[PDB]
Each structure stands twice: as C-alpha cells, then as structure tokens.
UniProtKB/Swiss-Prot annotation, chains A, B:
Name of the molecule in the record: Bromodomain adjacent to zinc finger domain protein 2A
Record PTM text: Deacetylation by SIRT1 in late S phase enhances pRNA-binding, allowing de novo DNA methylation and heterochromatin formation. Acetylation is high during S phase and declines to background levels in late S phase when the silent copies of rRNA genes are replicated.
Native source organism of the sequence: Homo sapiens
Subcellular location as annotated: Nucleus, Nucleolus
The record's note on its domains: The bromo domain and the PHD-type zinc finger recognize and bind histone H4 acetylated on 'Lys-16' (H4K16ac). These 2 domains play a central role in the recruitment of chromatin silencing proteins such as DNMT1, DNMT3B and HDAC1.
Phosphoserine: modified positions: S73
Subunit-structure text: Component of the NoRC-1 ISWI chromatin remodeling complex at least composed of SMARCA1 and BAZ2A/TIP5, which regulates the spacing of histone octamers on the DNA template to facilitate access to DNA. Within the NoRC-1 ISWI chromatin remodeling complex interacts with SMARCA1; the interaction is direct. Component of the NoRC-5 ISWI chromatin remodeling complex (also called the NoRC nucleolar-remodeling complex), at least composed of SMARCA5/SNF2H and BAZ2A/TIP5, which regulates the spacing of histone octamers on the DNA template to facilitate access to DNA.
Span within the parent record: 541 to 649 of 1905
Function: Regulatory subunit of the ATP-dependent NoRC-1 and NoRC-5 ISWI chromatin remodeling complexes, which form ordered nucleosome arrays on chromatin and facilitate access to DNA during DNA-templated processes such as DNA replication, transcription, and repair. Both complexes regulate the spacing of nucleosomes along the chromatin and have the ability to slide mononucleosomes to the center of a DNA template. Directly stimulates the ATPase activity of SMARCA5 in the NoRC-5 ISWI chromatin remodeling complex.
Residues bearing PTM Phosphothreonine: T8
Length: 109, 109
C-alpha cells in the first residue's frame, strides 16, 4: 500500500532505469506558456495521460515499475525538457539545459 | 559538399546534442532477429525512414544538424537499444546495456 501520494524525484527517475522515457514539453498557448508531460514506454508507445500509463501497466509485463513511480507534473525536474521558440525563421523546438530548467518550472501555468 | 558517405559514430551522435533521439529496436520476426532504427525530432515526431528525416529537415528550422548526421543502420552503436523478449509471462521490451549491444549488432540480419 503506497499511501504517500507525493512522488520523490528519485522515484520518478526509477522508470528511466527500466527503459521508459519522460519528457516535459513547453510552448506558448492562447495566452501563456504551458508544459505537458509525455512518457514513452519501453516498447516505444507515447503516453500523455496518467490513465494511459495505468492501462499500459496492466497490459504489459512490468517488474520494477509501478504507478507510484509516475508523475505527469511538468514541474517535476526529471527527464528531458524541450521548448518551442519563435524567431523570424520559424518555430523551433530546442532541448533545455539543466541551468534553464528551474526558470521554466517556475514560469509555467 | 559531403562526398564521404560513411558517417562516423561521432557524427551520428551530433543530433543527440540538438534535441533529437535515436533508438534501435530489436525483435524476432518470421524467421530471425531484426533491428530497426527510429529517430525522434526535437518536436517529438517519430521517424522510421531516411526520406522522412529529409522531409523534416526541409520543413523545420535546423541549424547544426544536416542529412550527413543521420544513419538508419541498426548496426551503428549510437543511441538507446531495446529488445523484445518472450517469457512465460509474455512479451517484454527491455533496454539493453552497453555490454549487451555489440553481440546484438553482430546478430541482426
């Protein structure tokens, strides 16, 4: 029984040791900047919502990874962060550095 | 003019510094084990064929990454390697270790 609801970053890192990937993707919307979390399961399936991950865990052979290890919070600094930037050349996606990540976490809404 | 056709592993690593990801995925087919290379562009788009990457480079703002930096060879040991395994529990995808990769490269056809 995982009764404690707040995953630690160490926990959220654990699937990344078992073939999963986590990304946080940031872009400007209607009025402000927003971020969204994606997971990729070890088979390569992209998942954007927590209920998709729950279904995946039920449909797949998973040993070490459980629902307690996931977080869709774009404020949790685990995994690779990307941002959509506009210049006169067009919209570009760039991966953020570690140094850039904390300011983005503060900025998204 | 890139006249030299054989990309070095250092070259194939370069997009991975500019937000791209590369994977090699191995599974047993009709009669033997086979591997396939996927790229993810910095926007998150999954690409499985070299002409998809050429089209992407034309449709996107890319500064440092050029067609010379790509290889769809599952024998090029750059990026993350995954393999589909069968046990009585079911089919499982696992990420391979560095130590495991060379034997797989030799084994695929």
């Amino acid at each position: 029984v995982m009764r404690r609801r707040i995953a630690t970053p160490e926990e959220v890192r654990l699937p990344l040791q078992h073939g999963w990937r986590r990304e946080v993707r940031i872009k400007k919307g209607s009025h402000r900047w927003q971020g969204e979390t994606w997971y990729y399961g070890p088979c390569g399936k992209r998942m954007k919502q927590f209920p998709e991950v729950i279904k995946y865990l039920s449909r797949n052979v998973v040993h070490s990874v459980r629902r307690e290890h996931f977080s869709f919070s774009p404020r949790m600094p685990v995994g690779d962060f990307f941002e959509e930037r506009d210049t006169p050349e067009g919209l570009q996606w760039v991966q953020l550095s570690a140094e850039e990540i904390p300011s983005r976490i503060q900025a998204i809404t």
